[PDB]
Design an enzyme around this catalytic site. Structure first.
Site, PDB file in Angstrom:
ATOM      1  N   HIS A   9     -21.475  31.554  20.013  1.00  0.00           N
ATOM      2  CA  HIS A   9     -22.824  32.120  20.075  1.00  0.00           C
ATOM      3  C   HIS A   9     -23.574  31.933  18.750  1.00  0.00           C
ATOM      4  O   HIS A   9     -22.977  31.765  17.698  1.00  0.00           O
ATOM      5  CB  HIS A   9     -22.859  33.631  20.348  1.00  0.00           C
ATOM      6  CG  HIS A   9     -21.723  34.153  21.179  1.00  0.00           C
ATOM      7  ND1 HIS A   9     -20.625  34.820  20.685  1.00  0.00           N
ATOM      8  CD2 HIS A   9     -21.538  34.037  22.523  1.00  0.00           C
ATOM      9  CE1 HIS A   9     -19.818  35.124  21.691  1.00  0.00           C
ATOM     10  NE2 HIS A   9     -20.346  34.658  22.814  1.00  0.00           N
ATOM     11  N   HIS A  30     -25.554  34.097  16.198  1.00  0.00           N
ATOM     12  CA  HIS A  30     -25.751  35.465  15.761  1.00  0.00           C
ATOM     13  C   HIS A  30     -27.019  35.594  14.915  1.00  0.00           C
ATOM     14  O   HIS A  30     -27.501  34.581  14.408  1.00  0.00           O
ATOM     15  CB  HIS A  30     -24.549  35.936  14.929  1.00  0.00           C
ATOM     16  CG  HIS A  30     -23.351  36.112  15.828  1.00  0.00           C
ATOM     17  ND1 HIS A  30     -22.663  37.303  15.844  1.00  0.00           N
ATOM     18  CD2 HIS A  30     -22.741  35.275  16.706  1.00  0.00           C
ATOM     19  CE1 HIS A  30     -21.657  37.201  16.729  1.00  0.00           C
ATOM     20  NE2 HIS A  30     -21.691  35.991  17.237  1.00  0.00           N
ATOM     21  N   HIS A  77     -25.178  39.196  18.376  1.00  0.00           N
ATOM     22  CA  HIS A  77     -25.743  37.986  18.961  1.00  0.00           C
ATOM     23  C   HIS A  77     -27.269  37.961  18.800  1.00  0.00           C
ATOM     24  O   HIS A  77     -27.904  39.014  18.918  1.00  0.00           O
ATOM     25  CB  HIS A  77     -25.380  37.921  20.452  1.00  0.00           C
ATOM     26  CG  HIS A  77     -23.913  37.842  20.765  1.00  0.00           C
ATOM     27  ND1 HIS A  77     -23.386  37.747  22.047  1.00  0.00           N
ATOM     28  CD2 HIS A  77     -22.844  37.839  19.928  1.00  0.00           C
ATOM     29  CE1 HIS A  77     -22.068  37.696  21.983  1.00  0.00           C
ATOM     30  NE2 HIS A  77     -21.713  37.751  20.704  1.00  0.00           N
ATOM     31  N   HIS A 122     -25.812  40.912  27.121  1.00  0.00           N
ATOM     32  CA  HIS A 122     -25.038  39.688  26.936  1.00  0.00           C
ATOM     33  C   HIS A 122     -24.783  38.982  28.268  1.00  0.00           C
ATOM     34  O   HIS A 122     -24.512  39.695  29.241  1.00  0.00           O
ATOM     35  CB  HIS A 122     -23.663  40.006  26.324  1.00  0.00           C
ATOM     36  CG  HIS A 122     -22.801  38.798  26.111  1.00  0.00           C
ATOM     37  ND1 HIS A 122     -23.066  37.818  25.171  1.00  0.00           N
ATOM     38  CD2 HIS A 122     -21.666  38.418  26.766  1.00  0.00           C
ATOM     39  CE1 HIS A 122     -22.126  36.880  25.237  1.00  0.00           C
ATOM     40  NE2 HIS A 122     -21.264  37.229  26.209  1.00  0.00           N
ATOM     41  N   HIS A 163     -28.569  37.102  26.016  1.00  0.00           N
ATOM     42  CA  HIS A 163     -29.062  36.925  24.653  1.00  0.00           C
ATOM     43  C   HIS A 163     -29.524  35.497  24.423  1.00  0.00           C
ATOM     44  O   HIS A 163     -28.926  34.540  24.934  1.00  0.00           O
ATOM     45  CB  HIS A 163     -27.924  37.250  23.673  1.00  0.00           C
ATOM     46  CG  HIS A 163     -27.374  38.626  23.822  1.00  0.00           C
ATOM     47  ND1 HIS A 163     -26.092  38.970  23.522  1.00  0.00           N
ATOM     48  CD2 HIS A 163     -27.959  39.776  24.230  1.00  0.00           C
ATOM     49  CE1 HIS A 163     -25.894  40.255  23.729  1.00  0.00           C
ATOM     50  NE2 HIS A 163     -27.031  40.777  24.172  1.00  0.00           N
ATOM     51  N   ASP A 171     -26.589  33.277  23.404  1.00  0.00           N
ATOM     52  CA  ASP A 171     -25.373  33.118  24.209  1.00  0.00           C
ATOM     53  C   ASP A 171     -25.117  31.695  24.664  1.00  0.00           C
ATOM     54  O   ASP A 171     -25.764  31.224  25.603  1.00  0.00           O
ATOM     55  CB  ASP A 171     -25.414  34.032  25.451  1.00  0.00           C
ATOM     56  CG  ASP A 171     -25.312  35.487  25.054  1.00  0.00           C
ATOM     57  OD1 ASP A 171     -24.809  35.715  23.934  1.00  0.00           O
ATOM     58  OD2 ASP A 171     -25.718  36.403  25.800  1.00  0.00           O
ATOM     59  N   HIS A 183     -15.241  32.134  18.397  1.00  0.00           N
ATOM     60  CA  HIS A 183     -14.491  33.376  18.449  1.00  0.00           C
ATOM     61  C   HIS A 183     -13.012  33.206  18.820  1.00  0.00           C
ATOM     62  O   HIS A 183     -12.585  32.150  19.281  1.00  0.00           O
ATOM     63  CB  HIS A 183     -15.119  34.305  19.490  1.00  0.00           C
ATOM     64  CG  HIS A 183     -16.351  35.025  19.027  1.00  0.00           C
ATOM     65  ND1 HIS A 183     -16.318  36.314  18.544  1.00  0.00           N
ATOM     66  CD2 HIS A 183     -17.651  34.637  18.991  1.00  0.00           C
ATOM     67  CE1 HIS A 183     -17.553  36.684  18.218  1.00  0.00           C
ATOM     68  NE2 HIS A 183     -18.384  35.690  18.474  1.00  0.00           N
ATOM     69  N   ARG A 219     -14.236  36.910  14.872  1.00  0.00           N
ATOM     70  CA  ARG A 219     -14.980  35.698  14.543  1.00  0.00           C
ATOM     71  C   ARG A 219     -14.100  34.796  13.690  1.00  0.00           C
ATOM     72  O   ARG A 219     -13.742  35.147  12.561  1.00  0.00           O
ATOM     73  CB  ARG A 219     -16.300  36.078  13.850  1.00  0.00           C
ATOM     74  CG  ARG A 219     -17.029  37.193  14.572  1.00  0.00           C
ATOM     75  CD  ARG A 219     -18.221  37.739  13.787  1.00  0.00           C
ATOM     76  NE  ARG A 219     -18.940  38.750  14.559  1.00  0.00           N
ATOM     77  CZ  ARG A 219     -20.088  39.322  14.254  1.00  0.00           C
ATOM     78  NH1 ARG A 219     -20.712  38.992  13.125  1.00  0.00           N
ATOM     79  NH2 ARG A 219     -20.629  40.225  15.064  1.00  0.00           N
TER      80      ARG A 219
HETATM   81 CU   LIG Z   1     -20.415  35.451  18.718  1.00  0.00          CU
HETATM   82 ZN   LIG Z   2     -24.489  37.660  23.702  1.00  0.00          ZN
END
Ligand SMILES: [Cu+]
Ligand SMILES: [Zn+2]
Ligand SMILES: [Cu+]
Ligand SMILES: [Zn+2]
Lengths: 153, 153
Positions: B46, B48, B63, B71, B80, B83, B120, B143
């Site tokens: 994603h 952020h 995010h 999400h 998001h 995403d 992730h 992360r």
């Molecule tokens: Cu993320």
């Molecule tokens: Zn998200």
């Protein structure tokens, strides 16, 4: 208003965090933070065109220069947008950076977000060295550390 | 074409280079590259909100979510902006990424340049995990690596 931040890293010991703050849209930008592991004295400090670290600081490209001018000091009208002049490291090799600049911005055409901050081996001659290299890079030598400028809160 | 690039790094072996290209400002973005050092299987991926690496990936914030939605997966209308779903690592720990997305952008008041791309620990459940964590992070866990997204030549 807008804030940005940059973590400087390189192949040697030079490292640090630089903060950017712009209270008003196209107001001045306050630049401050601490860089360590530098030799005592002056070191060139500029925003370079690309936020590209795929080949360390070399892939950052030249000084950010959307108006296609010659290199200068930050007080000059004839300068690159990214020309922030020098930062000074003390006898313990720490530069407590404190700059205010009204040509860089955190938005619009002179926006530096996504670009690369670089601190150099030697002093920037601010375009006064009398050779072609002086009005390109200020003769500041190699790139000791760099980081991509990111959006912060 | 607008172009961007991101070098992913972390405290472990996970690292990679991700490219972005957007031919038209109102067109989709192509995302491609590779990430290595991953366990075999799906890993959440994603943008952020903050391009702040002062605490490694931890300072990047949640995010990127300018429209204040839950999400989701990249193909969900409820998602998001940041995403991008999952990347898939092979049995050699290498994820070859090739994504096209029409919600993120490399320009405009909501572009992702200067923000942080994160890969992730675990799979993203795409917001369909049936718990409040799922509609916040996708249950994707820690992360493993990240970088600020920068402007490329
Ligand atoms: Cu993320
Ligand atoms: Zn998200
Ligand atoms: Cu420079
Ligand atoms: Zn310059």
């Amino acid at each position: 208003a807008t804030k940005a931040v940059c973590v400087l890293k390189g192949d040697g010991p030079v490292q640090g965090i630089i903060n950017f703050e712009q209270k008003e849209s196209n107001g001045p930008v306050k630049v401050w933070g601490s860089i360590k592991g530098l030799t005592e004295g002056l070191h060139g400090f500029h925003v370079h065109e690309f936020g590209d670290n795929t080949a360390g600081c070399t892939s950052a490209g030249p000084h950010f220069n959307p108006l296609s001018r010659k290199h200068g000091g930050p007080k000059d009208e004839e300068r690159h947008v990214g020309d922030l002049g020098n930062v000074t490291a003390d006898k313990d090799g720490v530069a407590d950076v404190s700059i205010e600049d009204s040509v860089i911005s955190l938005s619009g055409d002179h926006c530096i977000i996504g670009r690369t901050l670089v601190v150099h081996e030697k002093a920037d001659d601010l375009g006064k060295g009398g050779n072609e290299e002086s009005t390109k890079t200020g003769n500041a030598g190699s790139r000791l550390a760099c980081g991509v400028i990111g959006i912060a809160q």
